[PDB]
Amino acid sequence: SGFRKMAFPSGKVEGCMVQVTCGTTTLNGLWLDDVVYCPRHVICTSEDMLNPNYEDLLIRKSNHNFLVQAGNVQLRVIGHSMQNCVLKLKVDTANPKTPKYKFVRIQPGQTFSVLACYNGSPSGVYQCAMRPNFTIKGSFLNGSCGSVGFNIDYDCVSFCYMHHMELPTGVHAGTDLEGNFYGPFVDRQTAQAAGTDTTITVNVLAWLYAAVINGDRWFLNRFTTTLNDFNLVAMKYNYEPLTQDHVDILGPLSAQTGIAVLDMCASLKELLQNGMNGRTILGSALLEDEFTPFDVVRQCSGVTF
Amino acid sequence: SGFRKMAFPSGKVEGCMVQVTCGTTTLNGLWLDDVVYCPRHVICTSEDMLNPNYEDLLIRKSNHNFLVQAGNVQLRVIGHSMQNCVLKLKVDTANPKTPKYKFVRIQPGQTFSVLACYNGSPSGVYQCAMRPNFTIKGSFLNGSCGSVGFNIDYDCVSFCYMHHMELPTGVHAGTDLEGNFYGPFVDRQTAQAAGTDTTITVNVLAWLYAAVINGDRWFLNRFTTTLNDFNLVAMKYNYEPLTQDHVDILGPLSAQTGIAVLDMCASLKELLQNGMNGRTILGSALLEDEFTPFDVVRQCSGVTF
Ligand code: NA
Ligand code: NA
Fold this sequence. Notes:
Chains A, B: Residues 1-305 are cytoplasmic. Two copies of one chain form a homodimer. The first copy, chain A, has 305 residues and is an alpha+beta fold. Chain A has helices at 11-14, 54-59, 201-214, 227-236, 244-249, 251-257, 261-274, 293-301; strands spanning 17-22, 25-32, 35-39, 66-70, 73-75, 77-83, 86-91, 100-103, 111-118, 121-129, 148-153, 156-166, 172-175. Chain A has a domain at 201-300: main proteinase (3clpro) structure, domain 3. Helices cover 23% and strands 27% of the residues of chain A. In chain A, helix 3 (201-214) packs parallel to helix 8 and helix 4 (227-236) runs parallel beside helix 7. The longest helix of chain A is centred in the last third of the chain and has 14 residues, at 201-214. Chains A and B meet through strand 9, strand 10 and helix 8 of A and strand 9, strand 10 and helix 8 of B. The complex binds sodium ion (2 copies).
């Protein structure tokens, strides 16, 4: 028993992290087959980032201006191209540790594991959620750019995130592995509005189901509600509106626990309106929204990879 | 910036997890050099666990009764011995993926990463603290026994924990890699008192320093205190007494932030006496005690492995 915020095992991704250097700038790259993927602003100086013309700056670069190091293995760059906000460096050797993988663009509310890296060396792993406003609240120090987020299904690594920037508000923004930013952000050092964030309602409900499975039941009440009535409360507390699709995804959890989704919604409504009265749920004094329904099912059944 | 509960990269440990089967019981083992380490109750049936005589039960076993599988690699068991509560199975092949490693018995209050495994296959990784009462609050389903906790320093893996049992209260107990239990627990299915747990005071203080570094400052007051006066409050709220050794460990954090440790203690005293008034610190509505001072320094400087 027990419930923890759990990241995927990072071994398959550790074997793909490389160090990319262009001039005075170093960051992390992702080495899959014979291509290295990294944020395009590796070609920028500190002054460039204020208003970079990436096409013009990349013209000044040749294959030999990119230094790629995999621990101590030198990679010979034989081609380079810019795809949106990522640089694709063709190297003359395929990574022998390349896992089975896909590139995925995830939806807001979904979760992934981040392997934080510095100078091409992994430092730690943690689980994140893509916020409804397409930011993440991570832990990214200077030099962490190029760190990737991923999910693992059996033997397949689905890469969904590459880190690019820290907004002046302290939250983090990045792209998919095709170089398209999540949200409205651009890779330049300017003030950038993230927009109102909301709480991921279906994730909070899944976590409440996890609480019941593990023995925390005090928040269960004798009330029920309707989808429309609940959504009036959700809007007041800046929660995502619940749809029937969300109700459907929560189906397995409701079957196991015998608690209908609308009954759990009425529990959540009372928590929103009355707080927790200084009590805790799964060791938290706040409503946690970084566990998807799939995350809860994984940890309550024990699936491996 | 940003602060996250971060586990070590698990790659070096993933390559050491094997599946150990004896009769109808399967759990996880740790394959280092030509020795596999696993919990000794792999030799027990469900009925045995009520009152097992491990010496007698092990007599019934021979080398060929132990089946060790590393993914698909068959390991040939050529010797077996019981060291305290662990079984040491000598195999005829040394693990080619054995990292540099040590066995360490950690102190209460220290943290480590857990690689949760099932049937010898890793499923997830998360950070834990060894509670003052020598339990851990993990996520261990049926079949997770043999999962290990570890720390990584540069290229060296320090193994400190092997999971053995879930207490009737839902918390978890295990041994070091020499098979000596942390705390008073034994590997039999009985009621076992864990004893009063306390909050790890030096870890809470280190986390408050992490909060100040990241911009959460609202809890800083214009008060100070003394070590004796603070410890009177700590005792009232079931916190570990703070010693000068703890003050010394917090030295680097106090130097960076310019906040003397006793000033931060006075902040903590006010939080204990008055609560948080519905505010948060680093996204938490509770005082977090699972970050050591070393953990905070690592994540505020960006050390790699
Ligand atoms: Na960068
Ligand atoms: Na067991």
